[PDB]
Design a protein around this ligand. Sequence first.
Ligand SMILES: O[C@H]1[C@H](O)[C@@H](O)[C@H](O)[C@@H](O)[C@H]1O
Length: 296
Amino acid sequence: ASSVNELENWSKWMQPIPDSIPLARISIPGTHDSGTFKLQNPIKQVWGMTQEYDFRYQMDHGARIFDIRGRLTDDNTIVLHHGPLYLYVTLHEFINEAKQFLKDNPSETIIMSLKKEYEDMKGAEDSFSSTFEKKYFVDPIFLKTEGNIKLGDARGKIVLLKRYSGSNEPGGYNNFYWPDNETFTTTVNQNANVTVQDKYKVSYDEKVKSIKDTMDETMNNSEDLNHLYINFTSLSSGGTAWNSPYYYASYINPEIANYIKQKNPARVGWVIQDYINEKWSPLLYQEVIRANKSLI
Ligand SMILES: O[C@H]1[C@H](O)[C@@H](O)[C@H](O)[C@@H](O)[C@H]1O
């Protein structure tokens, strides 16, 4: 499209953006541990809970990237897990919400990151990858194209970001290095590069700095369409009391929203965050979406 007013529409913000823009260049908000919104048991919350509303609320709020952690069970299905604890949500449940959303708003698309969160249940017939690829990925909403995925080829489909090994079906983003608790950079495809800031378990100070620092690198490298930037603003720690990802999120979100507001960047990258809601006055997900003004 041509009007900027279109980015203020959360359910369809990707509509005004050109069909030829690679998904890498787009500033896409996302959610960290997307399926933890059903954890309503106090002690489970202060540790696991990273969202308070459902996938659809999340999507109607501009979120187009979901952090999906699963696990194989006896019934040979894949469900959502937060470490060793079962979130009362399943993979099918995600894929259906994404479909209803996607049919109501065909101009959009969604990136689903899948990571094998826990070890498979003893009575599983197949491995994790094979089960996901033979029982789910074979579904047509999943885009089976690889390479520097353009927006045009992805509208209506579900782009996959692989955080599991042993894949056999071609499609979406190929699995890559991803070391533990740091910011790194690797190659994804022949034509692609990834800079990830994933410092979970770090002090607030270092966390805030890592976000802005990685954010500064993208603002500058803005016109490099073949280079993804994933920027997790989430920081989980030994919560228990006001130290839970909610407390941190109540500071880290407004903080980073404004930082983007004043800097008026032309690119912010893929900002994966916790607690997406409408409480934190400045709104991170909205600022990240707005920084796409430069593509229209
Ligand atoms: O607990 C962490 C955290 O949630 C990171 O953001 C995630 O990417 C890591 O894989 C996980 O071990």
